[PDB]
Symmetry: D2
Subunit: 494 residues, 4 copies
């Protein structure tokens, strides 16, 4: 079931979080955060900039000093704190889900059943890793005792997007804190509220001051300040491929800080002729339209084998036309508004480009409401690889259906992209499944399913969809600095 | 028990290696490689540039295609090939050691007993890793079967320095080949010969054409071409910190290729009052003077506790004065010439700066021979943290001895650096050793020893000394692209 | 902060626990459990036998059937349940500690601050392991996809001792439940209460019926029934070496069930001449006297270097004389009574033997109270290796102090034993610590400390002190059955 | 590509191997080893007994002493030695293959192409493990430094069968030697020759005396002396379930030595109606008839779905009737003789048993030649679960074909056995494969293939088919003794 929401939840936090205290921007400047469903301003938020970032970094660095409460804390206790933070989030689940929906636009039912649940599972998962990421005792040559210490990388700058505000924060905080690092987080200007409230919970949980610092603000200012900072040891970024470049260049230009990127995609969803029609159709719909189509791993290239193409398209169009668009607080709503005006216009622009280039508009294609940033579930058929809607990430409710003949053909076409975040394969055949999962150049390959995330399984991109991995044990690698200690001994023995 | 060397080894390879064939630069241009012991030209070498690197990348990419011999090869067989390569190198050990000394300048005895031995151990170590770097089967939530495939990152651009020509090539090829990647290597212009001959052995061993391609040439040309190439998936660089920045910026500006860096250092060698005097003195000498002082992790900051400072310095000066400098082919020679004129002049410049800033010159300080790039073993006493020779990497036979009082003091001074490649601690006290090894911010902390390397133990730097690790199991991480495959199953059970 | 105890807590559970329900023994027989501090009966407890064990096994087997709630449960959820169990035990902490002290005899302060704290840390540690014990994807030769599934071993029979009732229960349940196994636990006849109450908490936590079944009773009856059962897949035993043999014999004679043993010991505590006198004395005292000396890893062989022997002995005797013996509920009591009469007499018998064989009685040596099973802290000096009190496990407040001269001597004397559960070394010298830690043949070697347990570090014995390890990642191995799945694929690629 | 064999290979080794030297049995007794193809005696072999085993154990223990060549040797060097042994075995490949066939009876082509090839890959695989089985540095609570040492278990008694003489020796020596243990091996009385020759190669390779000792002789004498020896730390046995019990009982009755067992089986080969008929028929034949049916994991229960039963049986019978039985040295021979008379008679007995209980004899069922121990490829149809030929391991060329209807039915029937060594599933359906591979209670589950072994993939049984695993990383666990070292440090930091 799902508890009734407060459609107009009160905002308790809207400032910069440093040393477990709330601060106004040094410039005293604030920026408005809008409710995408109405287009009206929710409240003002402290606009952090370079100077505010500097304050946050110094606080983090201080909390990371040898002998500090955070450094001396037992690894198991860090796990205890993460579990406490999770318990607190669960206590304030209904409120957080409502505030998430208010600032993001996604359906309250989803924020409660999906986003929040995943946030809880992510933090609790990593909570258990806190005291289990062992170093090694190595059998080196000669009379020596060699071993490695898995230490925290240090002050970690984390910049996250707006599509999954709370979840993105969880994916970043979970591994970082589990391994004993300190954080200076830069949340999206479109969705700063939920993350800021969580900071209050981090304080309530008992995390030492300076361990987690959140600086709301713009990208070119606050974000770039973190990426170019001389005292930030590592930066984790999740967003567009274009900005990912800026981040890596900034890291190489400054202090050569370690970098991991989770960028965009143009994920291919391959439906073989032997697939379960009903299942594939529903999953292909979910694969694309999930979260208003604002998912980095969205199945934006639906490949369908010719023998079943016509039927698949017919069923897909019907499903899209039946997709309920409206008030995200209404239990019947399947699709809310896009995050903001910029995205709203961007998507309409892509739809226009799709029409211009010859793609067959099967349904939707325009605005779905007079107020808010609602867009009709759109489906394009007979899409070709060279079309703009087949190459660029739309990040909206715009489905692309392409036809193919052979398995060798679809492999080449699916892999012919600078992106490689994810891919899916729908088939009943064992050999086909194995052939494709191996051949596909993507960080995650789903078989007879889509958007199946687990805190236990790593997620990340190939090619220009990013570098490094998040979630699972792999998610701890980027947050660890390996130290080798080689000691001379009297006489080494096996 | 070292075999008599051939002081005038014949050069059989001096061109660009692509598809197991030797090619002249497209521009037909060549550059001279000098014997640092005489200053005379050994021979000309094909000067590779962008167009040459482009040919290399295409060959590598072709060898990496799905279904190719290298891709279909059993992981165990890749291990067999690496073992065969090692066997071939051992067969031609005496020749390679001589050719190494001829082009690099290091004593032949060291080339044979150290470099070649370490080359063999590295290749053989990784040969064993070829079929053991397992992926994982993950207990994800829901009715799904989730697992990861540890696939090769792809086309790897590897740029190596001149201080350890053969060894650096092995540290690179070992992990790359063991994990099934393809290589486009750019060797140092100062020492291209030995690596090129090894390429001939790579062909002889049976490695498929295009798996390993070597392009000799300059850095701003060939090296930059690789770092900025749109089809190179990963770049591994070892060299100066200055150039490391260029590499990472090039990667972010191009295709967001994965990057790992092994940069410079100013490693502190801490000698506590309770240390074994004789041992610490000898190890401190080796720590700094090894390989003409041309070691990335050289103990260029010798911290000595006041109570033993005087005696330590006296013994160190004596050892430095008795260090034999001369023909690297003479068995009595402990120190050969510096790699080239540029390094020769740079070192003298640092010695001049050391005198100008108030450091007490105890011995050496000038040229050691009329012909070649020989420098006298130089030792500076009463060095202060603020001095240039105390902050900048000299990369030559110039020792810095600093005095300290407390253990807390030395930690702070040792850690006050933008470098953090290595560090050492000499003491008989258990608690002191553990306190320091933990407190020191360096990739490798040696206790009662120095420059102890093992193919089993990872090596890499903290801060601006680099990112990522080489050697050991960790050395495989950067050469692996993790793919998650999540399959829907009828009913998941434990 | 130790809360005021209920020096006579009420017993709510005293029956057999099967399918989350309380049952009387099939025979309806019961056995008394005595308060060692008064010798008075606390209450009767259902005396389980073979027929009762058979019921428990069938219940366990049923809960382990493919498709059952326990088998289908998400691994992460098993973790949640273990964390819930912990929270429940923490809620009833004060009560459990008191009940522990009542049935066992250990000081309430220790039961609260040590036993329960460790029980909570153990369960919470393993809760985090529930969804992280991955299988592997293996790069096998040929066109195949090979991987391993880490499945539960199945029905696990767990037999535990009386020295740490609650903690031994946690050490067993934590790893077993985290890996998805089912349990048929046989608790000690001397201390069945606390475990039985925990079963109530297991039910309250939400664990499916049949997952954990507890059968109180005698060893030759219930215990042997489990060890010899044809449907028990694995048995984990902790107790004496003598019974350990019976366990392995029973396993081999029955169905070849997997076996792991945590037996007795005669752990050497080596005090080098350069050790911290005060610290070594206090730790050596703790090492032997902890938990009324009823610790499997007790430092029952205190080796002291001759140069410091006299002083160490003097200080040791003073500390032993000042050790407060009395009512466990009194805050000032450091030592409570022995678990039962049998142990009471066995200890006195050993003290008598110590006197008869020439060991020098320095203090104590007799009964400490008129009522209960209290024994005076006894210390024997000038003990020789061949003496009975130097070879056999006393399991009481009887300290053995031996004199030695050289480090080579002590290693040989320490290792000359059929036991090898633990050992300790006290010294300030780095080389000595490393030499001894490597040379000593024991599952755990403590340096400058003793009885330092962590749920993160494995514990187990060498030689006849047992086989297999508990705690840490290693504790999951014995509870895992490895399955290899090798699938034929169209064409294998790296 | 198989070199012409020496049909009458000379025997160079037929004594007891201790300390790299050949010794006669203390009793001077010898036993004949027979050529199963002719029934003639090949030669006599020293009959080792208890006293001979005692000598071997003492030699092994001596070679395992702290500071010995074997204990001090670099782990990487152990790998070098293993690779050398492999090279020597390959050098004498043709000879060993012929001698294997001479004493065992299996076809020379198979001995050369399969057995020897597998032996080479096993040792070479484990050679790579020697310096890679790392211990751990654990983030324990409090101010401590905790880590583990992966030490050798010690003196390992290894008892192997006669079905795969050389391969079984490799599966044993590889992991034991890679981890630095010492060995006392007891080879099968029916096939002692090849293992003894390999011992010569062991000495030639450079292994220190006492590291590997081989004692040929009978089971109740030599084998039992090893299992019950007071100085043998671990025993690995491969053979019948009956003797496996004796081994575990001996271990528990003696010194509680660690035990791993690889026993028999009655592995089910499930053929679904949608399987590739031709492929399944050929694979089901191989599954049962390989190595004269003398394979522990032989697919002795071929379950076939009713809709394809009739055709499958027809094709199976035809294939069985075409299977060439004859001189193992003739290239045309597919099946040689059974290992000895005892097995010969046992098989004939089971064949008669099958006829008596109602199983339909489709072909064969009798002796295939006048001389030797040749038996006709026998196929039984319409076999029922309750029949003896359906429950007990025949270990001969006798196929059982059973009919089933549903997938749920077959799972229950396949799992209804005290054996659980292996199983197979033939189907084109993804879901069926996953459903079955998860449901089957077997150590190895092959999908669309059978008898696919890889040094990288673990092998072992469930239930009464054994305990523990061999091959892969898992094969190292039983050969490792874990030691925890917990050191007190000034101040623990992350
Ligand atoms: O197949 P299989 O028929 O060879 O299996 P098997 O059990 O009959 O024999 C396998 C191995 O165990 C040895 N063995 C036999 N009886 C033994 C005993 N009582 N104690 C110790 N080892 C014994 C055998 O000699 C051989 O080495
Ligand atoms: Na917003
Ligand atoms: Na040169
Ligand atoms: Na009692
Ligand atoms: Na024979």
């Amino acid at each position: 079931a799902v508890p009734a929401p407060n459609q107009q939840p009160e905002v308790f936090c809207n400032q910069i979080f440093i040393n477990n205290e709330w601060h106004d921007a040094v410039s005293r400047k604030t920026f408005p955060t809008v409710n995408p469903s109405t287009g009206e301003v929710i409240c003002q938020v402290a606009e952090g900039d370079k100077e505010d970032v500097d304050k946050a970094v110094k606080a983090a660095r201080a909390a990371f000093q040898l002998g500090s409460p955070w450094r001396r804390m037992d690894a198991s206790h860090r796990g205890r704190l993460l579990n406490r933070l999770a318990d607190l989030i669960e206590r304030d689940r209904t409120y957080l889900a409502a505030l998430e929906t208010l600032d993001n636009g996604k359906p309250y039912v989803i924020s409660y059943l999906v986003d929040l649940d995943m946030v809880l599972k992510c933090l609790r998962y990593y909570a258990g890793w806190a005291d289990k990421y062992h170093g090694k005792t190595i059998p080196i040559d000669g009379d020596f005792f060699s071993y490695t210490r898995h230490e925290p990388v240090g002050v970690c700058g984390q910049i996250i997007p707006w599509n999954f505000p709370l979840l993105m924060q969880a994916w970043k905080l979970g591994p970082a804190l589990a391994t004993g690092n300190v954080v200076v987080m830069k949340v999206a200007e479109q969705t700063p509220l939920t993350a800021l409230y969580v900071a209050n919970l981090i304080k309530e949980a008992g995390f030492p001051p300076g361990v987690v610092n959140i600086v709301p603000g713009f990208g070119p200012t606050a974000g770039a300040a973190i990426a170019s900072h001389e005292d930030v040891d590592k930066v984790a970024f999740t967003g567009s491929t274009e900005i990912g470049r800026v981040i890596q260049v900034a890291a190489g230009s400054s202090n050569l800080k370690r970098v991991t990127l989770e960028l965009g995609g143009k994920s291919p969803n391959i439906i073989m002729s032997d697939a379960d029609m009903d299942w594939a159709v529903e999953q292909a719909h979910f694969a694309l339209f999930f979260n208003q189509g604002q998912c980095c791993c969205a199945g934006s290239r639906t490949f369908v084998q010719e023998d079943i193409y016509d039927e698949f398209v017919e069923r897909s169009v019907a499903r899209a036309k039946s997709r309920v668009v409206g008030n995200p607080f209404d239990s019947k709503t399947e699709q809310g508004p896009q995050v903001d005006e910029t995205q709203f216009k961007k998507i309409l622009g892509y739809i226009n480009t799709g029409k211009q280039e010859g793609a067959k508009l099967l349904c939707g294609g325009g605005i779905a409401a007079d107020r808010g940033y609602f867009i009709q579930p759109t489906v394009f058929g007979d899409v070709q690889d060279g079309m703009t809607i087949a190459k660029e990430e739309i990040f909206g409710p715009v489905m692309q259906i392409l036809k193919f003949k052979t398995i060798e053909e679809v492999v080449g076409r699916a892999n012919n992209s600078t992106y490689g975040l994810a891919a899916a394969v729908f088939t009943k055949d064992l050999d086909k499944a194995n052939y494709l999962s191996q051949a596909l150049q993507a960080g995650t390959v789903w078989v007879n399913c889509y958007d199946v995330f687990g805190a236990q399984s790593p997620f990340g991109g190939y090619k220009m969809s990013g570098s490094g991995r998040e979630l699972g044990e792999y998610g701890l690698q980027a947050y660890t600095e390996v130290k080798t200690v080689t000691v001379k001994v009297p006489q080494k023995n096996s």
